[PDB]
Design an enzyme around this catalytic site. Structure first.
Site, PDB file in Angstrom:
ATOM      1  N   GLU F 153      18.948  48.512  -7.392  1.00  0.00           N
ATOM      2  CA  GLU F 153      18.399  47.155  -7.456  1.00  0.00           C
ATOM      3  C   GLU F 153      16.878  47.129  -7.625  1.00  0.00           C
ATOM      4  OE1 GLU F 153      19.675  44.339  -7.906  1.00  0.00           O
ATOM      5  OE2 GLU F 153      21.798  44.791  -7.610  1.00  0.00           O
ATOM      6  N   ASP F 154      16.437  47.614  -8.786  1.00  0.00           N
ATOM      7  CA  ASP F 154      15.048  47.604  -9.259  1.00  0.00           C
ATOM      8  C   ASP F 154      14.096  48.378  -8.351  1.00  0.00           C
ATOM      9  OD1 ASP F 154      16.100  46.019 -11.430  1.00  0.00           O
ATOM     10  OD2 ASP F 154      15.646  44.190 -10.341  1.00  0.00           O
ATOM     11  N   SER F 155      14.470  49.603  -8.037  1.00  0.00           N
ATOM     12  CA  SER F 155      13.626  50.504  -7.276  1.00  0.00           C
ATOM     13  C   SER F 155      13.543  51.825  -8.026  1.00  0.00           C
ATOM     14  CB  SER F 155      14.164  50.701  -5.854  1.00  0.00           C
ATOM     15  OG  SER F 155      13.273  51.455  -5.064  1.00  0.00           O
TER      16      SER F 155
END
Ligand SMILES: [Mg+2]
Ligand SMILES: [Zn+2]
Ligand SMILES: [Zn+2]
Lengths: 100, 446, 115, 59, 59, 179, 179, 99, 260, 67, 29, 49, 148
Positions: F153-155
């Site tokens: 999730e966007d890391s």
RNA sequence: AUCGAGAGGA
């Protein structure tokens, strides 16, 4: 749970199904009281569930389709009673904020 | 005393849209300056990690601690009364990997299985008899996943790629594509798992787990799924790259033929309009019948070229892998990357003549054809031509505007609803009443 | 700010035990070995040498959390044997393997340096 | 009563931020204005105004 | 700084790459942002769905 | 003309001479309504069906529709357009060397990157933005992979050993004033 | 990343823990594949592939938009001359165990940006700090040791929980207790 | 819309014919009719994209909007015209005039 | 039940790298050896810096960072030096550190490059790798006329697990099963994949036939040195260090067993 | 600003190769052939030289504060 | 003296370079 | 006053920072940095236990 | 002896709907003796099978040569005599369905026993008299050996 | 310290 063999005849008498479902319906109470207002409101509050219960748990489907034994049916009635009582709304539930 | 491990905290992400936006967590102290969340709870928070901050509240008494523990802890929030279904589910790598893991032809060696069993927190310590013995002992992925499933729950689901005829032909109970999911007595007998079985929809395994078992057993179920599957994925891997966006030359030729045909069909309809051969369908002005027909042709072309792209993908294709798992993407995204980005719209209509009878000074006047009015015939891998680029910017700007403008109206509606209903409560007589004690409902719901 | 000192990954704190042995109560002949200030480098070799032992029924390791610096090794044996004895024998086998690899590498270097 | 924001502190975070701030254009419609029409990318911006560079907030 | 070479700018501790185009007020670097306005001296005809005039022409 | 422009530093022939020769014309939006634009000189060639045969002007390069920050994007014609808008915002938040004389400046906040690199993949517009001379980033070896799950999730997962060597290290300057 | 793909660093692994190619290259950054398919930032993938060619060849790759002379097939063909798989994948080995990963991983040079948003400028906490003169509630903001606002939507959430004692604490005992 | 005139037309089915205007329903058919129609219209809006909300939430909103015998708006002109006390009203809108 | 008897075959050996094959060992051992090359072979590197003057354009932490990365010749001295944690001195002594000084002022119109040759050490066996008797010296900083850099530094023993400055390698190539007979990797289109340099397949065969019985048993290494240690000394130090870690663990295990 | 001492990815020393790289681009090597003459065989090391910007040469255009 | 398609890509960027050498980026300020 | 200081208000014993993923927490855990935990307190009653 | 069904089968088809999985393939086979029809998913990577191969199939309630129940736990050190040593490919699974042609008034003439071996499915169908040993939720071993 | 303005984050 009860290892029901679908391919053998059951020991469950269909009259135990009829009586057990009649007795179960009397324990699923949403409107308490013996007066005819309470009694009618109780019948209304549970009508659709009782129709579903009677049609699902009828003697012919228990014989031909589900083939449950007596001990398994006795378990099923207690399961339904317990799970219905756990579905009733708790006083103090802020149902307006929940709906919003 | 300082806050310490196992302290109960309220954790909140704004905007606080619903009761799952504030939940009770147990504190774990970790190095480095961030708060850290398990990934299943990112859904109820609508959280992601692109720079989001969240707020921690520490209840200051044994009474408010007991209240948060007994009411608002994350496990108790797994099912929402809004829609009688799970609010949190398996997501992202765990979902793509669990889809891959439960394929029929996944086989695990002894040491790999004994590694995976270190991550079951609820493992009984007994190693199951491998599905294959004599040539080499091998466990299937379904066999190890069955040890994750709690209790003796029973659940039928379909995988997302299940054929619609298979439920009626032969092999109904012996699915050739492994597309029928049966969990019986807690064992995954058959079927590939995807968002249909582990997502937030009603009747999923996590829903049935929450209904049959505790919140506590289901909390362990979510945790064990994530830890086991993420440690298998260190073996299996997952990626995406250029090789997933490329089709074969046959697919590109069939796409180009379909586009060329659609453009010739639009030219034909234009000629019929110019000659007044085009007859108005009822209830519509001739202009609206022309627009309806051109949009019909170009939507049929986009759908057909997308289907042609989708059917070209191998089972190794990573877009397909993320789409069939439901972890991310869609068939339209595949179609736009591989085949055709398609028609760009503003206010539900083709690109307007913002210049006099023209969309851009590059076109001729009264060009109602597809390129002029913003049909992007290229894919994102081919890359857009300059007019296609600018029309696609016109389209995307409308989504940015709607994202910025819709929010005040919806949030005002949310406020007014709360203020209208905030004191409506179930009383101890089981009637539902307002603060002035008037009966709203004699029984909640009915 | 909350940076841990980088030496905390391999130096014991005062009173920190290097290794602790606990019985696994749920099955017989099984132990958890908790080892502080160690990583995949020892866990993976110890686990793999244990799997070479025919009297070992289970061997696995985990790093419970990558910001913590400990490993858990779980071992189960046949009832004629002991997981502590398996773990000791495994370490002895690894030491002998590395001593033989070291001597053979010195020989290969000497041969390469002068034909 | 005077129109605000006509002069701003030059952004110096990075050279692109400086160059772009010197090339900024403002439509005095008002940040709270709900009408989509003046926010849409009009065709006549072709080659005059960048189609991509706009702030994704209320502006 | 007008017309100075890179060497003269460096001697004044200025950056040759700095574009200028801004002011210094009380030490703060201030940039003016261009303001859109409707063009003058042009006849525009407009209409609105809900007013007492059918058409208005404004200059 | 090109052959005169190629020795602009020697012959003093300029853009102004190109306008004075009547080769380039400034056109406003109101005059564009009347203009017929070729997107490239390939539109001027004869074709099996002629779309237009009466062009008045041609674009110099189509990429000039982009502004400063959007011009930093490589392959922007292969992205969904909101992602180009988000880059056009985030490129103004990237650390670099913001100006060469930063050592004399007393800016209240300043971030200076230790090891700016020019990008290995560049648009041709980046020449005029001086991005080659005040760059704001590092060419990073990126793997697109799930690995241990700490990038979901966007890391992103970073190489600690690269950070030890100074990868994306920066200095922060804060200035205080008193009288 | 220049393509609207933003994220925070989730963890850092040392070089021995990162995955590695057969030649000992580890990624500087690993990004998640689920970032790509709904964003359709294919320009990011083409940048990565072009950058891999660029670094092998020793040439700065042209990524100017609308250049028909550059396409993914030509970049792939150039990459195949340097001994890599034409679509940019490589066989990676797991750093913890050394086993080959079953899926080959897309890997290559990509330009990355550090943004001015850093965690140590954002971390905040309060317990019994200063209060405002007028309303006597906690100050506003990090720079004042301020308290976070427990707003009306949070109130409504705790009403829907039925958490009356915690709602009392947050809207009275933790803010402005008075007699 | 002109529901009362259309219902009385000679071949119109008077049992099924309906408006989407709830104030027309309330005028022609009354409070229990608008209680059912308001539920239908909100259900149609919520379910248009295939979303699902449990009936009891819609039911409770529609009952709140109709328990007083007239159409009560989710607006100051409804909510702040109830018998609720002034402190409740002031927490919504019109804060000073209410007090 | 017992140990492997691994075998070694060195195929290339230079001042910069050693290429070798280990055969008849387990993949876990081969990987832990690879990991120890990176993380747990100790070398000497600058880890304490004091700046007396710095008129350069680079701030002091920038200079210190750069100095820490300069590789120092470590071969026979690093086995003798103590860690500063184990040493008895109050701060520094010859038994746990090497002292360095640098002192450069630019007095000329030409730009003075300050390099690893301007570092002067107190121990003649611990010097910058580029200073050993071609490759140029590492650039520390450039000084304009009138700028000055003057500093004192101590170098300490450490290993790459603590900071990458103590990593002795410049790349560790590692490979096994060059022709994918074990199918640990699975290619969707094997014909697209270029051959390993260790392939034994003819050019018409994309990958070997599947071996259902095999397991990894032969491992190819290329260990490249940053220059602080000879490549073979990297390998022999890693084997000694891993053996020591195992012996220390067994000593603690045997105490724990006796305590139970 | 100034050439990194190490390649970020693999730790190879590159901080002694910049002036040689410039002295090979003069004498008309291609950037590829220049990198190959320097022994920069991995693309992660080539990236370091090929993408470097030597801004310290501009910083040295400013006179120091002290003479 | 027509610019043929093989020369066009260098030609137009020579033209654009000459423009930015003359005007720069803040000419309108 | 009513909406700004009564129906909602600023509160003590609260904290805010960037969130990051941690696959190794259970769903009911939160990972908290040590400076936040050292700054926030809980008033535990002293008892012979 | 614990054997539930034994017969010799001929592979009539392989993956007739096409290759659904790479390491697993679906055999379609017929008995010679009892005229049973068999569908069987096989890990053909470890045990390759070709069209027209003939093999012996045993389904057994236990691997032990003496009648002895199985706890279903993997003990690799068990040294009891095991019939697995007479066979080449062995799988472990549970019966999940028994379909038949029975009516309201007549028993079944044909039965269809379905078994999942960790998701490798089998359907054995034929005359009911051959399948009376199969019971739903019973664990069973498949043992298979090719015949020359 | 307050008030106002502007630029940003999700
Ligand atoms: Mg976010
Ligand atoms: Zn000492
Ligand atoms: Zn390198």
């Amino acid at each position: 749970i009860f290892h029901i063999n679908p391919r053998l005849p059951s020991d469950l008498h269909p009259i135990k199904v009829v009586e057990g479902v009649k007795e179960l319906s009397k324990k699923l109470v949403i409107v308490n009281g013996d007066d005819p207002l309470s009694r009618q409101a109780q019948e209304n509050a549970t009508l659709l569930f009782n129709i579903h219960l009677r049609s699902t748990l009828c003697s012919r489907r228990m014989a031909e389709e589900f083939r449950l034994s007596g001990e398994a049916f006795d378990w099923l009635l207690g399961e339904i009673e317990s799970k219905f009582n756990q579905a009733i709304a708790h006083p103090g539930e802020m149902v307006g904020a929940l709906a919003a | 005393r300082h806050m310490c491990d196992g302290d109960i905290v309220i954790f909140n992400r704004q905007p606080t849209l619903h009761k799952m936006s504030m939940m009770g967590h147990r504190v774990r102290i970790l190095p480095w300056s961030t708060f850290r969340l398990n990934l299943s709870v990112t859904t109820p928070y609508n959280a992601d990690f692109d720079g989001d901050e969240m707020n921690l509240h520490l209840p200051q008494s044994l009474e408010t601690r007991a209240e948060i523990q007994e009411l608002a802890m994350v496990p108790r929030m797994i099912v929402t009364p809004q829609s009688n279904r799970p609010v949190m589910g398996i997501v992202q790598d765990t979902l793509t990997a669990v889809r891959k893991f439960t394929k029929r032809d996944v086989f695990l060696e002894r040491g790999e299985v004994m590694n995976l069993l270190m991550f079951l927190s609820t493992w009984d310590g007994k190693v199951p008899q491998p599905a294959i013995l004599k040539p080499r002992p091998l466990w299937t992925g379904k066999q190890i996943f069955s040890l994750i499933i709690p209790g003796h729950i029973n659940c039928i689901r379909t995988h997302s790629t299940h054929p619609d005829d298979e439920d009626s032909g032969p092999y109904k109970h012996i699915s050739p594509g492994d597309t029928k999911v049966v969990v019986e007595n807690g064992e995954l007998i058959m079927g590939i798992l995807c968002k249909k079985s582990l997502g937030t929809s009603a009747g999923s395994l996590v829903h049935i787990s929450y209904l049959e078992m505790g919140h506590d057993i289901t909390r362990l179920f979510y945790s064990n799924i994530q830890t086991v599957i993420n440690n298998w994925l260190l073996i299996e891997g997952h990626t995406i790259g250029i090789g997933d966006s490329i089709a074969d030359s046959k697919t590109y030729q069939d796409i180009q033929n379909t586009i060329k045909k659609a453009k010739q069909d639009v030219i034909e309809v234009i000629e019929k309009a110019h000659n007044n051969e085009l007859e108005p369908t009822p209830g519509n002005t001739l202009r609206q019948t022309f627009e309806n027909q051109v949009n019909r042709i170009l939507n049929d072309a986009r759908d057909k070229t997308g289907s042609s792209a989708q059917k070209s993908l191998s089972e190794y294709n990573n877009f397909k892998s993320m789409v069939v798992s439901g972890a991310k993407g869609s068939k339209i995204n595949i179609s736009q990357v591989i085949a055709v980005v398609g028609q760009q719209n503003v206010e539900g209509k083709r690109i307007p003549f913002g210049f006099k009878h023209r969309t851009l000074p590059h076109f001729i006047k009264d060009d109602y054809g597809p390129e002029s009015r913003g049909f992007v015939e290229n894919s994102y891998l081919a890359g857009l031509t300059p007019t296609e680029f600018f029309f696609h910017a016109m389209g995307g700007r409308e989504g940015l505007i709607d994202t910025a403008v819709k929010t005040a109206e919806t949030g005002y509606i949310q406020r007014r609803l709360i203020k209208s209903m905030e004191s409506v409560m179930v009383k101890y007589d089981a009637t539902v009443r307002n603060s002035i004690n008037q009966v709203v409902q004699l029984r909640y719901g009915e | 700010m909350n940076a841990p000192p980088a030496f905390e990954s391999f130096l014991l704190f005062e009173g920190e035990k290097k290794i602790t042995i606990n019985k696994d109560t749920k099955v017989p002949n099984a132990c958890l070995f908790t080892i502080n200030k160690e990583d995949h480098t020892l866990g993976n070799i110890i686990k793999s040498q244990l799997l070479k032992d025919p009297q070992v029924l289970f061997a696995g390791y985990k790093v419970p959390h990558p910001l913590e610096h400990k490993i858990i090794i779980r071992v189960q044996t046949t009832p004629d044997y002991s997981p502590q004895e398996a773990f000791t024998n495994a370490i002895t086998d690894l030491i002998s393997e590395l001593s033989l690899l070291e001597e053979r590498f010195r020989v290969a270097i000497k041969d390469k340096q002068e034909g | 009563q005077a129109r605000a924001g006509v002069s701003q502190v030059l952004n110096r975070l990075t050279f692109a931020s400086t160059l772009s701030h010197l090339r900024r254009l403002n439509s005095p419609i008002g940040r709270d204005g709900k009408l989509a029409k003046p926010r849409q990318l009009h065709n006549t911006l072709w080659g005059m105004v960048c189609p991509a560079e706009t702030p994704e907030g209320h502006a | 700084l007008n017309g100075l070479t890179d060497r003269d700018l460096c001697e004044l501790n200025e950056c040759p790459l700095d574009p200028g185009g801004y002011f210094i007020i009380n030490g703060s670097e201030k940039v003016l942002i261009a303001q859109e306005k409707m063009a003058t001296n042009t006849v525009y005809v407009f209409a609105k769905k809900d007013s007492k005039y059918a058409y208005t022409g404004e200059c | 003309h090109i052959d005169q422009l190629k020795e602009r530093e020697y012959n003093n022939y300029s853009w102004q001479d190109l306008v004075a020769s009547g080769v380039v014309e400034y056109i406003d939006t109101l005059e564009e309504e009347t203009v017929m634009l070729a997107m490239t000189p390939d539109d001027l060639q004869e074709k099996e069906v002629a779309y237009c045969s009466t062009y008045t002007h041609c674009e110099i390069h189509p990429s000039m529709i982009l502004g400063v920050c959007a011009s930093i994007i490589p392959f922007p014609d292969h992205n969904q357009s909101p992602r180009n808008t988000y880059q056009s915002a985030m490129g103004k938040q990237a650390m670099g060397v913001y100006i060469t004389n930063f050592h004399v400046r007393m800016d209240t906040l300043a971030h200076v990157l230790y090891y700016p690199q020019k990008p290995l993949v560049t648009t041709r517009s980046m020449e005029y933005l001086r991005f080659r001379e005040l760059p704001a980033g590092i060419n990073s070896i990126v793997a697109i992979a799930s690995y241990t799950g700490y990038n979901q999730e966007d890391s992103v997962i970073m190489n600690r050993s690269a950070v030890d060597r100074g990868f994306f290290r920066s200095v922060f300057y804060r200035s205080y004033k008193e009288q | 990343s220049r393509h609207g793909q933003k994220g925070t660093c989730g963890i850092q692994y040392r070089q021995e823990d990162m995955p590695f190619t057969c030649e000992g290259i580890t990624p500087d950054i690993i990004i998640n594949p689920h970032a790509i398919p709904s964003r359709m930032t294919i320009g990011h993938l083409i940048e990565c592939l072009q950058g891999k060619v660029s670094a092998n060849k020793g040439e700065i790759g042209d990524a100017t938009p609308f250049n028909d002379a550059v396409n993914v097939q030509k970049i792939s063909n150039l990459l195949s001359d340097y001994g890599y798989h034409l679509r940019g994948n490589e066989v990676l080995y797991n750093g913890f165990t050394g086993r080959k990963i079953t899926s080959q991983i897309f890997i290559g040079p990509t330009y990355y940006q550090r943004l001015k948003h850093m965690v140590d400028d954002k971390i905040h906490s309060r317990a019994r700090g200063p209060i405002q003169i007028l309303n006597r509630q906690p100050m506003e903001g990090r720079s004042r040791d301020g308290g976070l606002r427990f707003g009306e939507m949070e109130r409504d959430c705790q009403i829907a929980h039925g958490a009356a004692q915690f709602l009392r604490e947050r809207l009275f005992e933790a803010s402005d207790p008075y007699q | 819309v002109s529901l009362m005139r259309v219902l009385s037309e000679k071949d119109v089915d008077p049992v099924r014919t309906t408006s989407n205007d709830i104030v027309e329903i309330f005028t022609v058919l009354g409070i229990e009719a608008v209680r059912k129609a308001l539920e239908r219209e909100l259900y149609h809006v919520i379910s248009f994209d295939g979303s699902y909300v449990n009936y009891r939430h819609l039911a409770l909103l529609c009952d709140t909007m109709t328990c007083r015998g007239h159409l009560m708006a989710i607006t100051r002109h409804g909510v702040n015209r109830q018998d609720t006390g002034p402190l409740m009203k002031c927490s919504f809108e019109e804060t000073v005039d209410v007090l | 039940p017992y140990a492997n008897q691994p075998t070694v075959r060195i195929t290339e050996l230079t001042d910069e790298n050693v290429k070798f094959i280990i055969e008849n060992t387990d993949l876990a051992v081969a990987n832990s050896i690879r990991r120890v090359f990176i993380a747990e072979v100790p070398i000497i590197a600058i880890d304490w810096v004091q700046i007396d003057a710095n008129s350069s354009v680079l701030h002091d932490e920038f200079i210190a960072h750069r100095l820490g990365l300069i590789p120092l010749t470590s071969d026979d001295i690093v086995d003798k030096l103590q860690y500063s944690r184990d040493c008895t001195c109050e701060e520094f002594c010859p038994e746990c550190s090497v002292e360095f000084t640098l002192d450069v002022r630019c007095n000329e119109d030409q730009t003075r490059h300050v390099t690893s040759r301007d570092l002067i050490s107190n121990s003649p066996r611990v010097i910058p790798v580029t200073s050993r008797n071609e490759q140029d010296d590492i650039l520390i900083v450039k000084l304009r006329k009138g700028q000055e850099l003057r500093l004192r530094a101590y170098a300490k023993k450490g290993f790459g697990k603590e900071h990458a400055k103590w990593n002795p390698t410049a790349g560790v190539a590692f490979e096994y099963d060059p022709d994918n007979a074990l199918r640990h990797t699975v290619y969707p289109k094997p014909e697209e994949w270029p051959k390993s340099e260790y392939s034994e397949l003819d050019e018409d065969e994309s990958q070997a036939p599947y071996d259902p019985n095999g397991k990894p048993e032969r491992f190819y290494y290329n260990v490249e040195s940053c220059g602080s240690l000879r490549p073979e000394t990297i390998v022999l130090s890693a084997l000694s260090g891993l053996k020591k870690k195992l012996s220390d663990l067994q000593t603690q295990l045997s105490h724990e067993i006796q305590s139970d | 600003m100034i050439i990194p001492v190490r390649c970020f990815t693999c730790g190879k020393i590159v901080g002694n190769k910049w002036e040689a790289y410039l002295g090979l681009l003069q004498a008309e090597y291609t950037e590829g052939d220049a990198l190959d003459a320097l022994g920069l065989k991995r693309y992660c090391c080539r990236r370091m030289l090929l993408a470097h910007v030597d801004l310290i040469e501009k910083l040295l255009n400013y006179a120091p504060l002290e003479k | 003296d027509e610019i043929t398609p093989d020369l066009w890509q260098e030609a137009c960027w020579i033209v654009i370079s000459s423009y930015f050498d003359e005007k720069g980026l803040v000419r309108q300020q | 006053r009513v909406r700004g200081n009564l129906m909602g208000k600023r509160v003590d014993f609260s904290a805010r920072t960037v969130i990051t993923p941690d696959p190794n927490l259970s769903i009911d855990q939160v990972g908290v940095p040590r400076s936040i935990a050292a700054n926030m307190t809980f008033a535990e009653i002293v008892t012979p236990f | 002896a614990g054997i539930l069904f034994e017969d010799i089968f001929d592979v009539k088809d392989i993956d007739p709907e096409g290759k659904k999985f790479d390491r697993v393939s679906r055999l379609h086979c017929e008995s010679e003796s009892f005229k049973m029809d068999l569908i069987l998913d096989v890990n053909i990577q470890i045990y390759p099978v070709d069209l027209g191969d003939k093999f012996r199939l045993v389904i057994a309630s236990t691997l032990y040569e003496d009648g002895t129940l199985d706890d279903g736990e993997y003990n690799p050190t068990d040294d009891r005599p095991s019939r697995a040593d007479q066979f080449e490919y062995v799988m472990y699974g549970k019966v999940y369905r028994i379909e038949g042609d029975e009516t309201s008034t007549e028993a079944a003439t044909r039965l269809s026993a379905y078994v999942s071996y960790g998701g490798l499915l089998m359907r054995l169908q034929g005359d009911a008299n051959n399948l009376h040993g199969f019971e739903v939720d019973s664990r069973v071993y498949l043992l298979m050996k090719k015949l020359a």
